[PDB]
Ligand binder design. Structure first.
Ligand SMILES: Nc1ncnc2c1ncn2[C@@H]1O[C@H](COP(=O)(O)OP(=O)(O)NP(=O)(O)O)[C@@H](O)[C@H]1O
Length: 304
C-alpha cells in the first residue's frame, strides 16, 4: 500500500554515475543539492512494497550503527512511481585486485570493521544473511569499511524457522546447504570467515563446488569429513549415502599447503586461529561477533 517513511523530495538529489546493478535495483553515485554532500542513490522497481518496507525498517533500526550503510532519505518519483533509497557514499576498492597489496593491518581493519557492524546488527536482532566481499565497501586509502545491501537481512527470533535460500553461492554455511531451518545470526560469522580465507589465501571465492554436495565435500577437504558427519548427526540433517561415504575419506587438511611466498606474510598464526574459529562447522559453536572482536589478531589495530 504505502511506505513507512516520511518521504523526501526527489529534487533534493542529483545522480552522477551508475555504480551498481542488482537483482532489485540500479545504483548510482550522487549528491545532495543544497549540501553538495556525496551520496548513493539506490533506485528500486516499485515492486514488493512489503520488501521495501522491511528493508527500510531494518536500516532505520541500524541508524548510527558503526560501518553500516546509513539511510538518509527515501523518495518516490512522482511520474514513474519508482522508489529511491538515499544512502551514504562509501568508496569500494575491490579486494580481488589488492592481493599482495593488502597488509596484515588492512585485513584486520577490514574484518574488525565488519565485525563491528555485525555486533550492532545482532545486538538489535538483525542478521544480514549475505556477508561477502561484494557487500563490503573497502577504502584502501582511508581504511573505511561499510557493510551494505541489507535487502536479504531478517529479524531474528530464537528457534524460529527461516528460508535457507539466502547468502551467495560459495558463502553459504553448512546450515544452509544442509537445510537446517532454525539457523542463527552465526551464519554471518561463517560468511565473514569465508571472506577472511579468501583474503589470506588470495582466492575469492575461496570455497568452490558445482552443486551443494560438492560444496560440502570441498569444505571438508579443509575441515574434515568427521566434523560434517557429526554436525549432520547432531542436528538431524540429511546426507546422501554417497556423500557420507566420500566424507569419511577426508581427514581435513586445514590450512596446509595454502601458504606460499606471496601470502606468507599475511598468514600470521593469529589470523589462522581466528579463521579456524570463524569457519567452525557447528553453527552453535562459532564465536559471536563480540567474541571475535576480542581476538588477539585485532590487538594492534584496537587502538583505532
Ligand atoms: N552504499 C553503497 N555504496 C556504494 N555502492 C553501493 C552501495 N549500495 C550498493 N552499492 C553497489 O551497488 C551494487 C548492487 O547493490 P545492492 O545493494 O547489492 O543491490 P540490491 O539489488 O538491493 N541487492 P542484490 O540483488 O543482492 O545486489 C553493490 O553490489 C555495489 O556495487
Amino acid at each position: 500500500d504505502e511506505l513507512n517513511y516520511p518521504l523526501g523530495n526527489i529534487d533534493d538529489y542529483s545522480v552522477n554515475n551508475r555504480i551498481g546493478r542488482g537483482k532489485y535495483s540500479n545504483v548510482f553515485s550522487g549528491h545532495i543539492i543544497d549540501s553538495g554532500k556525496p551520496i548513493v542513490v539506490k533506485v528500486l522497481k516499485p515492486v514488493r512494497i512489503m520488501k521495501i518496507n522491511r528493508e527500510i525498517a531494518i536500516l532505520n533500526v541500524l541508524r548510527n550503527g558503526p560501518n553500516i550503510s546509513q539511510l538518509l532519505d527515501v523518495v518516490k518519483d512522482p511520474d514513474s512511481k519508482y522508489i529511491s533509497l538515499i544512502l551514504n557514499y562509501a568508496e569500494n576498492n575491490d579486494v580481488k585486485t589488492l592481493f599482495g597489496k593488502m597488509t596484515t593491518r588492512d585485513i584486520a581493519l577490514y574484518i574488525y570493521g565488519v565485525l563491528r557492524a555485525l555486533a550492532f546488527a545482532h545486538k538489535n536482532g538483525i542478521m544480514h544473511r549475505d556477508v561477502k566481499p561484494g557487500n563490503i565497501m573497502w577504502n584502501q586509502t582511508t581504511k573505511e569499511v561499510s557493510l551494505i545491501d541489507w535487502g536479504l537481512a531478517e529479524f531474528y527470533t530464537p528457534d524460529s524457522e527461516y528460508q535457507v535460500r539466502v547468502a551467495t553461492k560459495y558463502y553459504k554455511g553448512p546450515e544452509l546447504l544442509l537445510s537446517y531451518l532454525k539457523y542463527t545470526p552465526s551464519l554471518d560469522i561463517w560468511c565473514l570467515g569465508c571472506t577472511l580465507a579468501g583474503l589470506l589465501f588470495h582466492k575469492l571465492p575461496f570455497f568452490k563446488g558445482r552443486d551443494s554436495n560438492e560444496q560440502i565435500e570441498r569444505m571438508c577437504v579443509y575441515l574434515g569429513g568427521q566434523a560434517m558427519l557429526d554436525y549432520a548427526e547432531k542436528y538431524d540433517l540429511k546426507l546422501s549415502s554417497s556423500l557420507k561415504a566420500r566424507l569419511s575419506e577426508l581427514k581435513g587438511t586445514m590450512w596446509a599447503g595454502l601458504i606460499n611466498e606471496s601470502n606468507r606474510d599475511i598468514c600470521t598464526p593469529q589470523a589462522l586461529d581466528l579463521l579456524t574459529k570463524m569457519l567452525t562447522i557447528d553453527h552453535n559453536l562459532r564465536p559471536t561477533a563480540e567474541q571475535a572482536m576480542k581476538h588477539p589478531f585485532f590487538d594492534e589495530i584496537r587502538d583505532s
